[PDB]
Amino acid sequence: NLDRSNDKVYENVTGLVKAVIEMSSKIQPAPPEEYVPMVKEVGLALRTLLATVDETIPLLPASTHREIEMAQKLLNSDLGELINKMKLAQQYVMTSLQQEYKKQMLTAAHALAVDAKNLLDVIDQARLKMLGQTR
């Protein structure tokens, strides 16, 4: 119901989600020299999203602000948890425990994606309350 043609928030949340998805789908058959740069991708995507959000806050109801900020905070946290796991799977490279730590990357990542999506919903709301939509 909201025109997206010039909605970066959306556009960026979409990138972040894709980054995750493509990483989580290429993860199992892959080596560290392949999944680290993938994770870096997620980061860059997350970073870009966050900046965009920052500039958007100044144009949304002071009310919402707090939540959006909290939501932002989570996203960062998530990425970290991901990076930690990535380091782990990186350590136990060719071993009996690699394919197991990778599954933890998967979980971390998926969380990131879910929260990224919620950030969108929170902001989508601000946008609607601001544009003055009915009940």
Side-chain angles (χ1 to χ4, degrees):
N1 293 300
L2 279 174
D3 179 327
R4 303 294 182 177
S5 48
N6 301 296
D7 177 336
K8 290 312 173 185
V9 174
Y10 178 79
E11 172 170 344
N12 294 42
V13 175
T14 296
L16 183 48
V17 167
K18 279 183 178 176
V20 168
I21 287 169
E22 204 233 276
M23 182 247 267
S24 50
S25 64
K26 296 193 172 192
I27 225 166
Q28 286 309 340
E33 61 202 302
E34 279 195 356
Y35 53 74
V36 159
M38 262 170 215
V39 188
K40 285 177 186 155
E41 281 303 310
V42 172
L44 167 53
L46 172 59
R47 289 203 291 285
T48 302
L49 166 63
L50 289 173
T52 307
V53 183
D54 289 317
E55 328 174 325
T56 300
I57 302 173
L59 306 192
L60 297 168
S63 45
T64 72
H65 292 205
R66 261 47 216 174
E67 165 165 41
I68 295 180
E69 294 182 299
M70 220 68 271
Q72 270 186 291
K73 191 155 298 183
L74 176 63
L75 276 170
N76 267 309
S77 191
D78 291 358
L79 174 50
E81 232 263 292
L82 176 59
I83 287 183
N84 274 285
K85 301 296 191 171
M86 164 189 63
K87 289 200 174 82
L88 265 170
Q90 233 193 307
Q91 179 169 66
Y92 302 123
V93 192
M94 312 118 310
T95 81
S96 62
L97 299 187
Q98 67 159 178
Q99 303 295 54
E100 168 47 57
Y101 269 115
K102 272 179 176 171
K103 294 178 187 177
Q104 296 165 61
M105 257 164 93
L106 288 182
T107 319
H110 177 274
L112 190 56
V114 178
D115 293 327
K117 295 182 83 171
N118 187 272
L119 181 70
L120 212 202
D121 302 325
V122 180
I123 299 186
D124 265 336
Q125 291 296 285
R127 262 217 196 73
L128 295 191
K129 177 182 160 185
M130 241 305 90
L131 299 187
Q133 207 216 324
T134 325
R135 72 180 176 184

